[PDB]
Amino acid sequence: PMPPSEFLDKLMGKVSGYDARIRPNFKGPPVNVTCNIFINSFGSIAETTMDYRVNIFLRQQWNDPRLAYSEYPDDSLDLDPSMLDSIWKPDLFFANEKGANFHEVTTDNKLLRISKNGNVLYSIRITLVLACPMDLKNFPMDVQTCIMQLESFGYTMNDLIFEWDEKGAVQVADGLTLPQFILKEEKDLRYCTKHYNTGKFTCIEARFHLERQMGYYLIQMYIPSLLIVILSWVSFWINMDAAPARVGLGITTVLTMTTQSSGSRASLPKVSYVKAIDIWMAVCLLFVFSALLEYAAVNFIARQHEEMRKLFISRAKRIDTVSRVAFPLVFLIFNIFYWITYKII
Amino acid sequence: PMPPSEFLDKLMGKVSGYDARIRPNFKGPPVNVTCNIFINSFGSIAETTMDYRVNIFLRQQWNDPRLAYSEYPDDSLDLDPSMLDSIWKPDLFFANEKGANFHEVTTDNKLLRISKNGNVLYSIRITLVLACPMDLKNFPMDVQTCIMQLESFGYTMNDLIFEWDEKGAVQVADGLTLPQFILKEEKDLRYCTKHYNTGKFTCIEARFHLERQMGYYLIQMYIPSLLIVILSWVSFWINMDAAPARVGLGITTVLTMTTQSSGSRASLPKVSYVKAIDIWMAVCLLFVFSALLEYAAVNFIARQHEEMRKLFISRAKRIDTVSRVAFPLVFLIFNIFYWITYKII
Amino acid sequence: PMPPSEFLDKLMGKVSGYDARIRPNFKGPPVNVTCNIFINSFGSIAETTMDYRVNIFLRQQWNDPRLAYSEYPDDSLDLDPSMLDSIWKPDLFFANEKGANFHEVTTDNKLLRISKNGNVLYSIRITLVLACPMDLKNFPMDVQTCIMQLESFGYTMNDLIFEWDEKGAVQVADGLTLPQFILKEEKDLRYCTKHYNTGKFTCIEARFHLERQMGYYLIQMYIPSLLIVILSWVSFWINMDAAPARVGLGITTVLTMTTQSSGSRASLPKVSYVKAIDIWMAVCLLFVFSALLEYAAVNFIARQHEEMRKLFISRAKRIDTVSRVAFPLVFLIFNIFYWITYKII
Amino acid sequence: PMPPSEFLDKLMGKVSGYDARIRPNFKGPPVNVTCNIFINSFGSIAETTMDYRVNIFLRQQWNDPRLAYSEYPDDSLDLDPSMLDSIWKPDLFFANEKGANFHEVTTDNKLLRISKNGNVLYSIRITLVLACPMDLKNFPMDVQTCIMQLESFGYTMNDLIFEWDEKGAVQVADGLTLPQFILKEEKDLRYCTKHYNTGKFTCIEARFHLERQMGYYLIQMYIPSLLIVILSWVSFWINMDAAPARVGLGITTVLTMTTQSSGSRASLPKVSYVKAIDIWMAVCLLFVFSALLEYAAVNFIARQHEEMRKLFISRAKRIDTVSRVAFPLVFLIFNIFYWITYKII
Amino acid sequence: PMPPSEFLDKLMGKVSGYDARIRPNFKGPPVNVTCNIFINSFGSIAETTMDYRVNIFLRQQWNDPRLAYSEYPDDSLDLDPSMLDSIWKPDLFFANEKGANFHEVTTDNKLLRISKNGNVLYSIRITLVLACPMDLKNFPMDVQTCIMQLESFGYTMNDLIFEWDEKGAVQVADGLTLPQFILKEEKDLRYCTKHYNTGKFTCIEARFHLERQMGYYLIQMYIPSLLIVILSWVSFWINMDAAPARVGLGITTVLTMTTQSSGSRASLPKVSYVKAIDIWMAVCLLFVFSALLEYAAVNFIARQHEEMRKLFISRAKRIDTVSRVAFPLVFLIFNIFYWITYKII
Numbered sequence A, B, C, D, E: 001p002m003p004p005s006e007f008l009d010k011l012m013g014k015v016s017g018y019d020a021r022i023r024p025n026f027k028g029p030p031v032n033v034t035c036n037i038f039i040n041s042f043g044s045i046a047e048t049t050m051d052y053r054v055n056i057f058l059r060q061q062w063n064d065p066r067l068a069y070s071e072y073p074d075d076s077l078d079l080d081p082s083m084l085d086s087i088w089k090p091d092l093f094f095a096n097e098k099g100a101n102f103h104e105v106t107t108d109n110k111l112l113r114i115s116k117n118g119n120v121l122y123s124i125r126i127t128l129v130l131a132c133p134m135d136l137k138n139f140p141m142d143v144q145t146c147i148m149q150l151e152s153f154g155y156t157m158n159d160l161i162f163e164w165d166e167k168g169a170v171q172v173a174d175g176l177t178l179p180q181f182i183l184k185e186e187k188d189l190r191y192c193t194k195h196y197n198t199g200k201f202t203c204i205e206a207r208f209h210l211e212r213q214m215g216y217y218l219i220q221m222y223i224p225s226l227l228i229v230i231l232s233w234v235s236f237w238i239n240m241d242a243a244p245a246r247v248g249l250g251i252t253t254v255l256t257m258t259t260q261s262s263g264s265r266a267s268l269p270k271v272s273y274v275k276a277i278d279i280w281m282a283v284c285l286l287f288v289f290s291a292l293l294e295y296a297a298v299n300f301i302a303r304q305h306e307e308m309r310k311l312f313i314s315r316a317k318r319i320d321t322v323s324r325v326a327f328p329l330v331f332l333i334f335n336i337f338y339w340i341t342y343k344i345i
């Protein structure tokens, strides 16, 4: 017969009256475009910029009755990406792009297949820099949700309708990890249907649930700040008259709590509100601060000064034995109330 | 009848004498273009570069009497973005762009609607990197104002006039936060009307008021530097003859004030003038510096040396009891005068 | 005769029926494209982004029977890169691109040679930003494997087949080093043959084995943290009654362990799970933490207080002589179990 | 009459013999192009890259006698930026570009006006990344000069001559600040006239004088290092036999001088030569270093040991009273010679 | 006569049989292209990426006998950069580009001159991001050599030959400095002549010798670490029984050596092997480590305990007087062997 390249030029030439600027079923029912994505890459989840980049295969399927044929023998055709300007394609865009591009290395990474009844499969490769706003109030113990929504730009709801297909709407590649999160295998799929002053525009979205890993912040930040508060309680087991040994241990403990905290603020994100790790670094600073002021009272009671002089020594030995039990108890009450209120969420 | 794509080619072809290089109402009254924006994204407010990036829908409406029609039945047409070079469009630009681009993924993200009386709606999607100069003199307690002004480049004031529409000139998307600021819901809308040596060019601007959040700088920088100044007053409650305990507490307190200050200068911005956080870190360094020089005098008065030797001990016990009250009082006077002069602004 | 530029226009013009949109041997056996690369540059192996960039010469060879000739005398032709749109070229792409571009400085860096029997050599210069997921669980003692896979985008397995040539499939330039890794001279070459819902697409991949160098982390991080644990054992050789000398040495050792650890977390990568260097910095923090709590017991046993008072001094001298041998022994057991379990992998 | 778009096509069409590849007054006197700029933005003065970026309006005026007219009534025409390829324009470039681009958002930001006698005004909007080499030998007390030179690329001195206009050659926008510098209101305007082996090419340049602000480096770096040297002199007022109090104060002062210096090297630039701030941080390290070696001598003279034993105590009390006056005097001599030699420049 | 633009169209039109796809002297001797560069900018020598960027004028000269003329009177023509596609130009590229671009602001920054005998001068402006592998084994005392090689991509050695001209092959602009290196005025110029499996391709290269400046690393890193080792020797001049004064000075010296070292690893590059600055920071850590273990022995010999008790005091006073001389001697042996072995290279 004739080659498929010359048949598609016959099917969409100046003859037969095809126009790429006109949607199929024009002045009729709306075009139903069904979509699914294949995620190749996922990551660089930035938090100062509040975005993440993803690398997808965007597959679209619609019906175009002007592209139906019966004369060519084979049941499917494929159009070269150079001749792709002569197809009505949907004006899909991502409502939170924040930057995107195509891939055009060795060939345009684009695909088109026109079936015999007029079904059109259109698959392109996109790198997106999609934006998701992030809530770092409980920073190591947080769960993030980053959406991916797909609108139509120029056609309203009565002309073009997007849907997820009912067989695998979001696939993810196999060997795909993240430096700080894990990606759950549960994708919410829902409609949004944007309303502007311009009109009703269709949109569908896919949600991705991210759970931050914990093991670095425990070993590097929670456990070392825990041991410094234990070292601040060694002062209560050292006797009263060892005045360089008590304020030396008292201030070199608040210095190593300051060094532990200031050295780790470079690894933390740069939001301007209080996180959950920031409460821990500040409450553990109070337990080291309050253990020097304990000895400030003990050194002051034991110098006020006969049967009266043994009362002030007995009074200062009392508070040294109260705080020997009370500070591992008050810090335990905080250590229960901290981890319950950040694992109840 | 005939399709709208072939009707718009008839309306703007080589026949009927349409020219896209000529404004409507040429050699007459000026073109009145009315504008409104829809902010999709807002953030990455840089302070070394002194700019911020925004993602908008720019909607423009003007009247073009050459594009009026009556023969086509429907009350509005829409032009494909491929055929968009055959429209007179206003040469709007942003007078503080510092970099900008269009969005052209899966389709040019552009929209055109030509109504029946000649009204033209033109909506495009722009990512701007707009510049706003910032005033970080009172850094945590600052309010920023970042404008967004829209000039005409080639047409002067007698040929083209920009206006904000009187129904929602700036809309903002719903789920839109910032890592360090909050965006107030009050937008000033005013004229600027640039005068050059070239002519009078129209411009309209929109102002955005940003208020910096406070909670991180209190918990990480003000409160920890506060507790170190309290620890520097423990020395006055420790007796006079404990010479390693007084200068050990005196210098390990100025070391933990240096560690607290130097570890937080990496999180602060890099301007070359004094902020309000920089005054706090330097005045709190003086209160720890001055509490060692107090003991430098006490250790010197109590060694000058009979009824004369009990005067110098009584003189050194006097100044240890004066500064035991005076340093929480002088630091309270600064702590009142600091927060009043940075909340009166 | 005639010049080769005018002969290739005769061979592929509107006459003779050549079409660049149609593969050779159409409706027949699949096109066998044989490939090899030449790596010019290799590096910037990022770990927060989890990618690496490479600069290659991509050489492709296939047979095109429509391009066979006998009239021109010379045994090979070469086509100018301006006339390169008139060749069927394979739609190769890299399945993990994450960004790529061509080189077009002073000329398109592209090459085409059409032999007399129809063999076509096509060589282009590409800069890739290929993605490889990295496993930093055992961070200094890790071996990375970063693949480079080459699919076809639009032609399925029955139409186009990629192969590595059996003579030098991957060459690497001579003077080519890395800042943190070494590149082994062993490249695995294997098939992958992607299956989508679209079809069976050919792909071949090349694996590169990266071994991280060790010498910086020993001299800067392991050896200095080793010497601090030795300094923490000096306390057991200092006598019992030197109470400022024991807790001064005990806490300034946990402070210099905190300073050594916090100052090196800026040079470490920013994953959110525990590495092997992170276990070493935390276990060595326990050996300095536990050597103060040893003296907290010794100072407490030697103050409980006659023939009973010499028991508590003898009991506290016992544990000072046990831990004088036990802590270099328990730390040696960890130092054996650490390096065996990270050199068995 | 006829519209100006159709008149400019008549003035520069295939008829009347206009050629955009030929300069006006060809084979005659050279074209005199007069230039002025309007600076919109100015900043991000990098010092590792040694460049700065600027955002300008470049206005050019020349005479073209082929573009003179008398038939059209109005005294000035304006050409659309789409039709701008049909004008001879000067091949101006910036001799230190290091990267530049145009602005093409909503319209090409370009302007052309052809007056009646043939005068042509051409105004474009450019973002430049101009390079200026910087001299950071006296780093806080430095004055930078960053030029902006404008050559011709292809036309030599006998064909094209650039000049600054004698009425406002450089204008600067009003609300325009810098994070670390101030921009003086004095612009030097001079010729450079490049000589190559290709020929004599015209160029004009504009110089911008930048003066670095001081207030951050005083409050954060000079004053805190000043107070640490004062704290190192407290040791001379503490008596001789307080051996933990003298070497504790002596070494925790050299530690807080090391912490102050190492914490501020991250905010300093990364040149590989000695600055003026680097001399201050090193000389102030010597004054804290030399105050421990003073006590190393005092503790050694007072232990050499009768009428001889009171000589060595009197000798060690002598040097403790010499350095009590000498170190505030020798540090004052440096503090005079430092600020004079960096304010004489 | 006729203008030069219309004469060059006559010289290279469809008549006279010029073809830009065919080299001059085709099927004859090879084209001899002679080259020289003019360096405008040079710097941003990255070491994690291992590259440097340069801004050049690339001048090429060859002979094209088809472009010879005699009818036009003037001895040289110049072709507009718009008409530059109609010239055979050499397919030069840089064999280590790693990214490059042209400059096209206000005009393509390109130049062409066709002389009367057929000599063609072609000068373009290029920004290169050339790659040079760097050897940071002896980091402050290193000399770098970064090449710049210029191949041909498509023409082999029998068709096209590159040469440096014998009069100024590399010129450098006058006011051109570097933040960390100096550029020597000695450029090696040599051939490389790449051999591939494709053929023999010509290439010429130019080498640039970079010498790193020293003055920052001495004042900030070598001298401060030198003074800390001197402070660690003050302990030998302090007597034996001052047990808090000896281990306080001993451990606050290893802490200020850790602070000096960890604070400067952020300014050092991020290679994963040992440098020369890394040996200095580790050997100077041993001299401070070994001066506490000296006192660990002195405090242990002087407590073992009559005529026997004066032996152990005399034995411990012996080793305190040995190491008082030996540690300034052993550190002097290292300080000779260090600087000789890094200035012999």
Ligand SMILES: *[C@@H]1O[C@H](CO)[C@@H](O[C@@H]2O[C@H](CO)[C@@H](O)[C@H](O)[C@H]2NC(C)=O)[C@H](O)[C@H]1NC(C)=O
Residues within 6 Å of the ligand: A025, A029, A030, A031, A032, A161
């Ligand atoms: C696109 O899908 C919609 C939803 O299924 C279709 O709209 C319905 O079509 C049926 C008949 O097929 C009608 O009975 C319903 O009333 C329609 N619902 C509406 C308009 O809301 C529509 O026909 C589909 N269009 C195409 C071209 O497939």
Ligand SMILES: *[C@@H]1O[C@H](CO)[C@@H](O[C@@H]2O[C@H](CO)[C@@H](O)[C@H](O)[C@H]2NC(C)=O)[C@H](O)[C@H]1NC(C)=O
Residues within 6 Å of the ligand: B025, B029, B030, B031, B032, B161
């Ligand atoms: C654009 O808007 C301006 C301002 O409303 C219009 O100018 C006025 O027009 C009225 C008549 O409609 C005159 O009486 C006024 O004197 C005009 N004011 C001026 C010129 O300053 C103008 O007509 C509008 N143009 C179009 C095309 O709508």
Ligand SMILES: *[C@@H]1O[C@H](CO)[C@@H](O[C@@H]2O[C@H](CO)[C@@H](O)[C@H](O)[C@H]2NC(C)=O)[C@H](O)[C@H]1NC(C)=O
Residues within 6 Å of the ligand: C025, C029, C030, C031, C032, C161
């Ligand atoms: C491409 O290579 C394949 C694999 O060698 C070829 O397929 C085989 O061809 C032989 C005959 O040459 C048949 O006997 C086999 O049955 C084929 N195997 C298949 C189809 O799996 C194929 O012919 C080659 N095509 C070209 C154009 O060279």
Ligand SMILES: *[C@@H]1O[C@H](CO)[C@@H](O[C@@H]2O[C@H](CO)[C@@H](O)[C@H](O)[C@H]2NC(C)=O)[C@H](O)[C@H]1NC(C)=O
Residues within 6 Å of the ligand: D025, D029, D030, D031, D032, D161
């Ligand atoms: C461009 O400016 C130059 C400098 O003013 C002009 O050159 C001079 O022209 C006058 C006559 O107008 C002569 O008497 C001088 O000898 C010229 N000086 C030279 C050539 O150095 C030149 O004419 C101007 N050209 C145009 C086209 O305006």
Ligand SMILES: *[C@@H]1O[C@H](CO)[C@@H](O[C@@H]2O[C@H](CO)[C@@H](O)[C@H](O)[C@H]2NC(C)=O)[C@H](O)[C@H]1NC(C)=O
Residues within 6 Å of the ligand: E025, E029, E030, E031, E032, E161
């Ligand atoms: C390009 O330069 C080469 C080297 O000088 C020339 O090759 C030589 O030409 C001379 C005659 O001029 C012969 O005697 C030599 O045998 C040639 N050497 C070779 C081919 O290796 C060559 O002629 C020059 N070509 C042009 C076009 O100038």
